[PDB]
């Protein structure tokens, strides 16, 4: 994004900058969401081989 953010956690964080950081905050938690359901999927492809 061409529009950086100046406000931080300490001072008054407006509704604009808080909304921008949400974009990169959705990814992280949405990653382990499908891994906690079955983490034995990736390992299965390797253990059954060697």
């Amino acid at each position: 994004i061409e529009t950086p953010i100046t406000a931080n956690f300490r001072e008054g964080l407006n509704v604009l900058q808080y909304f921008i950081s949400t974009h990169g905050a959705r990814k992280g938690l949405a990653d382990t969401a499908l891994k906690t359901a079955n983490s034995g999927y990736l390992t299965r492809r390797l253990v059954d081989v060697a």
Partner: protein, 1335 residues
């Protein structure tokens, strides 16, 4: 004297949060208008099924108005009882009969008013539904608008797939309609996402010739033939991106010479001179494609057909012929590619017939298509509502896609819609124009609950409508209106399926009032098999910049689903036709108006809207000319003259779950997500205490939602009970006598969905004039009118001793000594008796093989009384079950035919208490089928109620007697004094004794009438009770009665419970350390809860700390104004200390000076901030680094924040001060999974020898392959061996092992596991064979 409310952040709230139930009520109301007439929702679906027209009969069923009949019960008997609650649906119908067969003379219009059709549930006074037994709520849906789009590309992920654009149509019911291109510059079409077909096969089926198709994707260029030469209607705009193949000259001026390309400059040069006619060679036209057919008007022979490419030979005949109007196609190599021109060639079909047949087989391959079937199917693809309906809103959104004028129209698509769309698709593929915004709310529409209920209702209609046509002939004359036509079966089997089996709808979260309101006001991205699944969502989970103030981008549940749900924000609301419109304060010039207006998601981008984080004195002036303003995604600095609109507040940005968060701006979205979920997992605590920092939404949730009881009409309270709050309304003369009696029932101890208990403790005392809108009773966790989930304790952040490692919580031993976190849990244990091979089971207390203490608490019917101190082992339900001839012994067979049949036929099979849990009975279930005779079960309880009701009269007649006779005596004595004489004769004779003529005699006469009148009212009052008890009986969906005993166990705070605040700091209690070791201040008051400061560096949530400094200094900031200035007015021994101790702390001129202001002045200075008792802090616009620090030096006691404590273990000076205060935390409810799962030896399965749990025996933990590789890795062999042998499967292993351990020795070496046997046998039976071999 007038001042300001004085609080954190200067953001005046003009329009308070509207009804939160606007998403449920408003939607479902317009859907099914019970009280109102018939319009929208169900009505919008009746005029599409009732108007049936079956030939060979001429019957027309006209619709009038639908009116919901009478419901089943109230709203409390749907939880405490076993009521399914299903209100029948009856609609007015007036059909006319026009027989067309044999002369019978039957002509009349019989009007069958009400006809039962389908059983659709209704919505409660709050916004929840009930089908089976538990509360069920339907969550809204959100997907792409049912119309057309223009994405990038798809399907070409395996190969290259470069330079390829496509369009997609996503309906709700029917087939798909795609349009993609291939590397061969050819367009195709996908129906129901199947094999690719020519994109011109669907057009021909709509009665379109080859000549017409060409005039639906390309513009026509008219060529003129005069003076034996070729001309052309030149169009500058069309020359964009083309090479000059000839000398473009006009009026003796060569604009573009042959050779050089045509830029954008030469285009404007032609538009300025208005050049619309130039000379063009024959080769230029040869590269074009003729539209229609052109024959020689001199010979009569065909020169060239349609679609055929022109040439130097074909054009040579078109010039000699004599034509003047040559209509061809304009195609080049760039912004006008011949895509459709090459589609007709790869199209097998040639007309409409070959098209309808080809499509029919493609959809339903099997039976040979016919003349009627082929046409019927096609019309039911995208041209019929009964199979393809894009609702009444889809049309509106579909119009703005093609830049249409009007927005109204039909739900189905036309032959002109698809074509106009494909036109834009080509433009994008060419170069002109770009893609469309998908994530934009302009496309992603919200599906209200009402609409959702209509979605599963329209399906059941097209299923029953196919039966009303046939049964129409089965009717005699004019009597085919009631059941002799429509059937209420196909509909019920279609609607009930969604209220249970559907993934979109799940169990209602009632573990907390706030958790309930956030469930209704929730949006889901998952739905039917016509949308998206769980596999993909990397384009819908992520919030779009356009989603501003319409949905909180961080209100999605934490766990399996992240970003798939996300509830709905606050001020945002589903308007009329989907388009979510968030409120905006219309501000003219430099004056802000208090008026509000709902702007569309597409209208917002047309106006510039300011922000809420802007300083405003009142509502008539602006702080600074240049202030940060936002548009529709960008950020620019506008003046107060350019500003047209402005946000309402910093509340609409988030939801009600995030609005409660004090310091949300100081928290990162990561942990802020869980912070809103901790409130969703709240639990009704005993000591309900409101936070020391409110935003202004804790009072709105309780009032609007069905949490706090609201009076119907003003009146005077006479009595206040815990179970009922009677309100004596003065509908007549003002007297204590009965009049407008309106009883209000308060739900006490009933089981919810999350095994929680909802209570309503009355607040109004004796004699208190209530007003319309006042509170009468509290709620599950509400204190008075606000919301209070958790509690307020003393917090001291400090790494204790290993305990608070990751996410752990340490609490003093005082927490268990007091029931501050003691919540109420309710578990349901249903016990059903079914038909046995020997006969129906019985429910009696006669159950052998038990102890005396077991049948002691049980009555003479097997059902335990209410209020029994039961425990692990005690019997709750007295159910019995026959054995069988196989289980019978020759000894008990003889006495079976001698001492009676009911002697030794049945055995022991009653419901006991699960091992581990131990509580008390709070509610028993009563049922008795009429066909099974009303035994001692429904007779004893009845007799008891008859005895109580009779006693309730003897006590009322006693008080009434000793209440009036004690008054008539003081009147009789006055004048006719008879002391020792009146206390002799019976009380019923005191009425016969008259008194000298006087106004006093009238008093005795009136009191004689009041006695007989009232008494006669109490006598009939008992009569009414002796009716309902001995009248009709309601049963359960089960068979042979059902006894549901609810168990309640005091769930104290024990190791394993998880607690968290409102910032996202989720943790679990470690060890309950005594008040001995735990540190404490210099003034006693030991620390209650201790957290880990290390949960800040990693977990970015500084906000939680801000609350800590706000809780400690709360005795000098804003609460000080209401904790000193308010208490000094009450107690006279405080007014002498507050006036002096205040100025010494706060010397700010802004603050209230107790020394100057009097008792009257200060009083009014404490009413401006009464609501915000524990100060007030908004969401993203409240506290500040500068404001806070200043407010910490005004009251007691520490400075800067931290303060010097002392170690609880050592007791010496604590090195360097620490941050302490009162943080508002919250306890999380305990799910069934939290209950310890103890198992050692239980029952096993049949086909397999795997242990299986259930009611009594707990389920065994699974040992997945993941755990297998663990022990497989270690050198251990016997450990993992028995793991899947002696432990579980192997049957001969579980026996020998147990018989060896009880002896004292080791278990015999693992022989042959059951797995080895079963598997081996599954091989021998086959063609192969496995056999074990020795060394």
């Amino acid at each position: 004297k007038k001042r300001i409310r004085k609080d954190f952040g200067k953001r005046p709230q003009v329009l308070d949060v509207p009804y939160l139930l606007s998403i449920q009520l408003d939607s479902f109301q317009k859907f099914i208008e019970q009280d109102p007439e018939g319009q929208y929702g169900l009505e919008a679906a009746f005029r599409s099924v009732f108007p049936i027209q079956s030939y060979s009969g001429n019957s027309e069923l006209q619709y009038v108005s639908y009116r919901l009949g009478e419901p089943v019960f109230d709203v409390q008997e749907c939880q405490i009882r076993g009521v399914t609650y299903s209100a029948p649906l009856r609609v007015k119908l007036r059909l006319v009969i026009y027989e067309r067969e044999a002369p019978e003379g039957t002509v009349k219009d019989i009007k069958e008013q009400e006809v039962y059709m389908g059983e659709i549930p209704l919505m409660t006074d709050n916004g929840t539904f009930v089908i089976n037994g538990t509360e069920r709520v339907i969550v809204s849906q959100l997907h792409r608008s049912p119309g057309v789009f223009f994405d990038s590309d798809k399907g070409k992920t395996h190969s290259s797939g470069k330079v390829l654009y496509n369009a997609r149509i996503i309906p709700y019911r029917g087939s798909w309609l795609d349009f993609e291109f291939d590397p061969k510059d050819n367009l195709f079409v996908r129906i129901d996402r199947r094999r690719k077909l020519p994109a011109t096969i669907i057009l021909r089926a709509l009665n379109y010739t080859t000549e017409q198709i060409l005039d639906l994707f390309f513009e026509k260029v008219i060529f003129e033939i005069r003076d034996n030469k070729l001309q052309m209607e030149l169009v500058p705009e069309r020359l964009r991106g083309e090479t000059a193949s000839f000398d473009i000259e006009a009026n003796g001026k060569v604009y573009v010479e042959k050779g050089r390309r045509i830029t954008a400059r030469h285009i404007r040069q032609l538009e300025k001179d208005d050049v619309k006619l130039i000379e063009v060679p024959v080769e230029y036209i040869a590269g074009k494609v003729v539209a229609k057919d052109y024959i020689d008007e001199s010979t009569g022979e065909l020169i060239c057909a349609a679609n055929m490419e022109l040439s130097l030979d074909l054009l040579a005949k078109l010039s000699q012929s004599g034509h003047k109007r040559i209509e061809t196609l304009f195609t080049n190599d760039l912004d006008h590619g011949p895509y459709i021109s090459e589609t007709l060639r790869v199209d097998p079909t040639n007309d409409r017939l070959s098209a309808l047949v080809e499509i029919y087989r493609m959809m339903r391959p099997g039976e040979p298509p016919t003349r009627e079937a082929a046409e019927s199917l096609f019309e039911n693809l995208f041209f019929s509502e009964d199979r393809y309906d894009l609702s009444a809103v889809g049309r509106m959104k579909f119009n703005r896609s093609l830049l249409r004028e009007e927005i109204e129209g039909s739900g189905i698509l036309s032959k002109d819609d698809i074509i106009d769309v494909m036109k834009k698709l080509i433009d994008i593929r060419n170069g002109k124009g770009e893609v469309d915004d998908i994530d934009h709310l302009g496309n992603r529409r919200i599906r209200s609950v009402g609409e959702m209920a209509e979605n599963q209702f329209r399906v059941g209609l097209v299923r029953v409508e196919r039966a009303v046509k046939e049964r129409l002939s089965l009717g005699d004359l004019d009597t085919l209106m009631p059941q002799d036509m429509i059937n209420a079966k196909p509909i019920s089997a279609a609607v009930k399926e969604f209220f249970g089996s559907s993934q979109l709808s799940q169990f209602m979260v009632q573990n907390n009032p706030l958790s309930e309101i956030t469930h209704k006001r929730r949006i889901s991205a998952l739905g039917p098999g016509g949308l998206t699944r769980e596999r993909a969502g990397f384009e819908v989970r992520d919030v779009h910049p356009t989603h501003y103030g319409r949905v909180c981008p961080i209100e999605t549940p934490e766990g399996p689903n992240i970003g798939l749900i996300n509830s709905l924000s606050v001020y945002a609301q589903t308007n009329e036709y989907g388009f979510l419109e968030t409120p905006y304060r219309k501000v003219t010039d430099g004056v802000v108006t208090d008026e509000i207006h709902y702007l569309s998601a597409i209208e917002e981008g047309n106006y510039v809207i300011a922000q809420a984080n802007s300083n405003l004195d009142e509502e008539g002036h602006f702080v600074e000319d240049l202030v940060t303003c936002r548009s529709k995604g960008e950020s620019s600095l506008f003046s107060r003259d350019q500003v047209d609109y402005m946000d309402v507040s910093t509340q609409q940005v988030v939801s009600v779950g995030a609005s409660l968060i004090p310091f949300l701006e100081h928290d990162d979205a990561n942990r802020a997500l869980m912070g809103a979920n901790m409130q969703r997992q709240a639990v009704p605590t005993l000591r309900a205490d409101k936070p020391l920092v409110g935003t202004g939404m804790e009072r709105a949730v309780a009032v609007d939602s069905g949490v706090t009881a609201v009076a119907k009409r003003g009146g005077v309270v006479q009595y206040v009970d815990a179970s009922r709050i009677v309100i004596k309304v003065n509908e007549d003369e003002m007297y204590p006598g009965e009049a407008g009696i309106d009883i209000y029932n308060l739900t006490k101890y009933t089981r919810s969905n999350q095994n929680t208990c909802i209570n309503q403790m009355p607040c109004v005392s004796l004699g208190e004039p209530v007003e319309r809108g006042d509170v009468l009773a509290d709620g599950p966790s509400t204190d008075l009118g606000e919301l209070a989930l958790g509690q307020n304790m003393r917090v001291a952040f400090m790494p204790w001793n290993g305990y608070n490692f990751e996410d752990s919580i340490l609490v003093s031993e005082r927490v268990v000594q007091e029931d501050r976190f003691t919540t109420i849990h309710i578990q349901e244990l249903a016990c059903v008796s079914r038909d046995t091979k020997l006969g129906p089971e019985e429910i009696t207390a006669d159950i052998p093989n038990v102890g005396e203490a077991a049948l002691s608490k049980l009555d003479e019917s097997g059902i335990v009384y209410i209020g029994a101190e039961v425990t692990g082992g005690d019997i709750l339900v007295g159910k019995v079950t026959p054995k069988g001839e196989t289980q019978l012994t020759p000894e008990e067979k003889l006495l079976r035919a001698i001492f009676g049949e009911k002697a030794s036929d049945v055995k022991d099979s009653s419901l006991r208490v699960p091992n581990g849990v131990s509580g008390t009975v709070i509610d028993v279930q009563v049922f008795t089928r009429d066909g099974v005779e009303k035994d001692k079960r429904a007779l004893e309880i009845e007799e008891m109620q008859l005895k109580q009701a009779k006693k309730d009269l003897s006590e009322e007649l006693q008080i009434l007697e000793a209440g009036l006779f004690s008054r008539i005596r003081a009147v009789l004595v006055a004048g006719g004094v008879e002391a020792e004489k009146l206390d002799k004769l019976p009380r019923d004779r005191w009425l016969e004794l008259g008194l000298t003529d006087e106004e006093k005699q009238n008093q005795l006469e009136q009191l004689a009438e009041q006695y007989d009148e009232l008494k006669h009212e109490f006598e009939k009052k008992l009569e009414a009770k002796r009716r309902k008890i001995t009248q009709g009986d309601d049963l359960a969906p089960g068979v042979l009665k059902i006894v549901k005993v609810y168990l309640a166990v005091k769930r104290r705070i024990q190791p394993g419970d998880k607690m968290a605040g409102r910032h996202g700091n989720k943790g679990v209690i470690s060890k309950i350390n005594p008040i001995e070791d735990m540190p404490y201040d210099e003034n006693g008051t030991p620390v209650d809860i201790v957290l880990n400061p290390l949960g800040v560096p990693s977990r970015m949530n500084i906000g939680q700390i801000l609350e800590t400094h706000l809780g400690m200094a709360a005795k000098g900031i804003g609460d000080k104004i209401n904790a000193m200035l308010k208490q000094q007015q009450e107690v006279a021994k405080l007014r002498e200390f507050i006036q002096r101790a205040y100025d010494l702390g706060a010397d700010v001129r802004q603050k209230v000076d107790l020394s100057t202001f009097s008792d009257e002045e200060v009083m009014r200075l404490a009413e401006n901030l009464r609501k915000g008792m524990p100060i007030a802090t908004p969401v993203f616009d409240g506290a500040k680094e500068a404001e806070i620090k200043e407010l910490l030096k005004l009251g007691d006691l520490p400075t800067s924040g931290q303060i010097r404590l002392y170690d609880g273990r050592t007791g010496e000076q604590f090195e360097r001060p620490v941050t302490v205060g009162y943080m508002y935390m919250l306890k999380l409810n305990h799910l069934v999974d939290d209950k310890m799962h103890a198992r050692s030896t239980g029952s096993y399965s049949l086909v397999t020898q795997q242990p299986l749990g259930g009611k009594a025996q707990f389920g065994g933990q699974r040992f997945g392959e993941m755990e297998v590789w663990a022990l497989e890795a270690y050198g251990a062999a016997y450990t993992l061996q028995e793991m899947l042998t002696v432990k579980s499967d192997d049957v001969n292993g579980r026996t020998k092992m147990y018989k060896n351990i009880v002896d004292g020795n080791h278990q015999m070496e693992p022989g042959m596991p059951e797995s080895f046997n079963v598997l081996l046998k599954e091989i021998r039976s086959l063609g192969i064979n496995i056999e074990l071999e020795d060394e």
